[PDB]
Amino acid sequence: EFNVVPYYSWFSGITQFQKGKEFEFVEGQGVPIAPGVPATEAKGYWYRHNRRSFKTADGQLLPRWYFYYLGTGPHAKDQYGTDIDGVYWVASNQADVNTPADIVDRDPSSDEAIPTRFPPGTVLPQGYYIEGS
Ligand SMILES: O=c1ccn([C@@H]2O[C@H](COP(=O)(O)O)[C@@H](O)[C@H]2O)c(=O)[nH]1
């Protein structure tokens, strides 16, 4: 969870379950599907939420990534493709990444997160679980 209110993503998260696996997509892939969104607007980044667990006396809570359209979210001002720790840029080959996507953020009690799904052919990152699936 968050102790500081996050920017809300339009989509469900993708959660790491195998340690040592890299979060990645093939260039041109990795933008989740949202009805009626034109491919020219399918551009943005996945953002890593590092999660932390509390200490017990038993015996670890791997990261979860969330998608933000280009020009929105916690890295709204950063340039597409720029190395940034915790940021993984993705865009349809139809998209011009010099321009912010035309999509206002999600207002979380006028609209719920869309379950994250990729088009046929999308190479899925092994070691990661798409929430909702
Ligand atoms: O940093 C964020 C941004 C949004 N999500 C929202 O959480 C819900 C699902 O999270 P998940 O467990 O499927 O990752 C969706 O509404 C998603 O947009 C968060 O709660 N944390």
Side-chain angles (χ1 to χ4, degrees):
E1 86 161 4
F2 304 91
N3 62 278
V4 169
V5 179
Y7 296 91
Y8 283 87
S9 168
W10 270 104
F11 305 93
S12 66
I14 293 168
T15 306
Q16 188 175 3
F17 72 85
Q18 292 186 275
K19 188 151 253 159
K21 301 260 182 290
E22 295 321 297
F23 183 89
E24 55 183 12
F25 289 95
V26 171
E27 178 165 8
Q29 304 181 9
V31 180
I33 301 173
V37 186
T40 45
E41 308 314 302
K43 39 178 174 181
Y45 58 99
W46 292 91
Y47 175 65
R48 185 177 47 202
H49 182 223
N50 291 313
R51 268 163 101 204
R52 241 208 113 142
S53 60
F54 56 72
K55 191 179 209 202
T56 55
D58 281 78
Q60 51 129 343
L61 228 214
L62 301 182
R64 177 172 279 148
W65 296 71
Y66 291 97
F67 179 81
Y68 296 95
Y69 284 104
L70 186 65
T72 76
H75 283 263
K77 289 179 179 93
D78 293 286
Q79 181 192 35
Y80 187 90
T82 293
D83 197 3
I84 307 175
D85 188 37
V87 179
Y88 192 90
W89 301 99
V90 299
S92 171
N93 50 41
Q94 304 295 294
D96 179 3
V97 315
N98 290 336
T99 181
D102 183 327
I103 302 173
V104 166
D105 289 355
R106 168 180 145 236
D107 157 18
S109 214
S110 63
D111 291 287
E112 205 91 320
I114 304 165
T116 282
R117 296 180 332 92
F118 303 103
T122 291
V123 175
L124 298 171
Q126 202 158 291
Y128 288 82
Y129 176 64
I130 307 160
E131 299 289 341
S133 64

